[model samples]
Target: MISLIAALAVDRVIGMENAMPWNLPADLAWFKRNTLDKPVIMGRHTWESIGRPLPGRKNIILSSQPGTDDRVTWVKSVDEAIAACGDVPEIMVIGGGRVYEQFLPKAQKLYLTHIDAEVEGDTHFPDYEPDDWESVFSEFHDADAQNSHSYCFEILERR
Candidate 1:
C-alpha cells in the first residue's frame, strides 16, 4: 500500500525556501502517528531539507546525486523507492511537490493537514480532484501556543 502525507497552507503552499513554512507541533505529531513504522519515501531536496533520517521508520530518498547517510537508503526513481519498500505493508511518500505528484496516482490514501491561514511559499502541494477521493476521517485543531496555526486533518482514500 502507498500513502502520502503533507500539510498545506490555506493557499496550497507546502514550502518556502525548500523547508516547511510553519511550526506546527501538533501537525508533526499527527504525521508521526500515521507514518511511523512505515517506509517513508522522499525526494532528495526533501531529505536535505529535513537534514536527517526520521526515527522509527525506513528512510528512502529518491535522487540521482550520490550522497551518504547512515540512516537513509538512496534510490534514483520512484519505481526504485517502491521496489525498495519490499514486503512492507504500507509505504509513505512524504514531501517535495515533485515526488508527491509522481506517487499521487498510485497512492491509496492521503493524510493531509489544511492550515487555516495563507502563507508565502515557493513550493506547492500538487493538485488533485476531490471528487476522486472520499474523506474517511476529519479533525479540526485550533491554533495554540505549541502549534502556530489552526489546521484540519483529513484522511482521504481513493474512491
Candidate 2:
C-alpha cells in the first residue's frame, strides 16, 4: 500500500516556508508509528528540508530535477519510484506541494494533521472532494489553552 501523509491548516496552507507550520508531537508519533521500516518517497523540497535519511526506512526522492547524490534514489517518475519499493509491505509518500499533487491519485490512504487554524501561505492543497475518499477514522485533540487552535487527525482511505 502507498500512503500520502501531510499536515494542513484550515485554509489548506501547508507551509509558509519549506518547513512544518506547527510543532505537533502527536503528529510526529503518528508518522513514526505508521511509516517506520517502510519506504518513504518525497519531492526534492521535502528532501532538502529533511536532509538526512529517516532512520530505519528507505528514502526515495521523486524529482524532476534531482540533486547530485549517490545515497538518495532520485527518480523522475512516480511509477518508477513506486516500483523501486520491492517487497516492502507499505510505502510512505511524503510531500512538499508538487509531490502531494502528483501522488494523490496513487495514494491508498491519507494521514493528515488537520489544523483548525489558518495561516498565510504560498502553497495550498487541491480542493478535496468527499466522493473521492471516505473518512475511516478521526481523533480530535484539545488545543493548548494559550494558543488553542483545535486540530484533528484524519485517516482517509481511498474509496
Candidate 3:
C-alpha cells in the first residue's frame, strides 16, 4: 500500500507551517498499530518535522542532502525507496508535499480521511479526479457523537 498522509492532520488536511493542529487519539492508535513494522518512506523536511526516527518501524527518508538519522535509511529517489522496501508487506509514503505528488500516480492503495474541516496552510494534496481512483471502501466517523471532529475514512485503489 503506497498511501499519502499528513500525520499532524489526524488523517486530514495537506497542512503546512509545521506541526499537526488537531489531536485525535483513536487515529494515532490506529497509526501505531498498522504501521508498526512497515517501511515508511518520507522526505527530508518531513523527517525534520518528526525530529527523530520513529521506533517499531523502518524509517526511510528520501532526500537529496545528507540528513539521515541513525534509525532512518536515506534514499535519493522514489525508485530507491521502493527497492529498499524489498519483500516488505507494505510501504507508506508519509509526506511533505513534493513527494506526495511524485508518487500519487504509482500508488496501489490509498487510505485517506477527509477531515470535515479545512485548515489554512501553504501545502496541499494533489488534485486527482475521484474517477481516477476506485473507491473500494469508506467509513464515516461523526464529530458530535465520537468527539472526532468529523471525518470520512476512505480507502481507494488506483485505476
Candidate 4:
C-alpha cells in the first residue's frame, strides 16, 4: 500500500520555519508506531528537518545528492522513489509539502492526525477530495500535559 502519513493543523499547516508548529508528544508516538520498519519516502527538506536517518525504517529521500549512510537512499524524483520501494507491501510517504502533493494521487491510504488548532506555516498538506476516501479507522486524543492540542488519528482508504 502506498500511504501518506502526516499531522496537520485545522488550517492544513504542516510546517513552519522547517519544523512542526505544535508540541504534541502523543502524535509523535503515533507516527513512530505506524511507520516503524516501513520503507519511508520523503523529500530533501523533510530529511533535513529530521537531521538523521530514522533508525528502524529504510529512509528513501528524493534529492539530487547522495545520502550519508546505508540506511538512507537518495532518489531524484517521485518515480525513482516509488521504484526504490520495489515490491514492498507498503510504503509510507512522510513529507514537507511538495513531496506530499506529488505522491497524493498515487497514495492508497492516508494516516492523518488532525490537530485542532489554526497555526501559521509556510508548508501545507496537499488537498484531496473527501468523497474519494472512506475512513477505515479513527481515534480521538485529548490534550494533556505532554500534548498541547487535541487531535484525531484517522486512517482513510481510497474508495
lDDT of each: 0.90, 0.83, 0.73, 0.91
Over 4 Å off, model 4: 66-71
Q: Which of candidates 2 and 3 reaches a greater lDDT?
A: 2
Model 3 lDDT per residue over 31-110, tens place: 67656778888888778888888787888899898754667798888899889888876788877678888888888877
Predictions: Cα RMSD each: 1.1, 1.9, 2.7, 1.3
- Local accuracy of candidate 1 as per-residue lDDT tens digits, 70-146: 67898987788999999988899998898999999999999999998787998888899989999999999899988
Candidate 2's residue-wise lDDT over 85-143, tens digit each? Answer: 88777789888788888788778889988988767877777667779899998999887
Off by over 4 Å in 3: 6-12, 144-148
Clashing residue pairs, backbone N/CA/C < 3 A, model 4: none
Which of candidates 1 and 2 is the stronger one according to lDDT? 1
Indicate which candidate wins on TM-score: 1
Question: In candidate 4, what are the lDDT values of residues 34-109, reduced to their tens digit?
Answer: 9998999998888888988898888999987776656589889889999988998999999979999999999999
Model 1 deviation from native, Cα RMSD in Å: 1.1
What C-alpha lDDT, on a 0 to 100 scale, does residue 22 get in candidate 3? Answer: 58
Q: What ranking emerges by TM-score with the best candidate at the front?
A: 1, 4, 2, 3
Could you tally the backbone clashes for each prediction? 0, 0, 0, 0
Q: Between candidates 1 and 4, name the one with more favorable TM-score.
A: 1
The TM-score that candidate 3 achieves is: 0.86
| TM-score for each model | 0.95, 0.90, 0.86, 0.95
What TM-score should be assigned to candidate 1? 0.95
Give the lDDT of residue 79 in candidate 4. Answer: 90
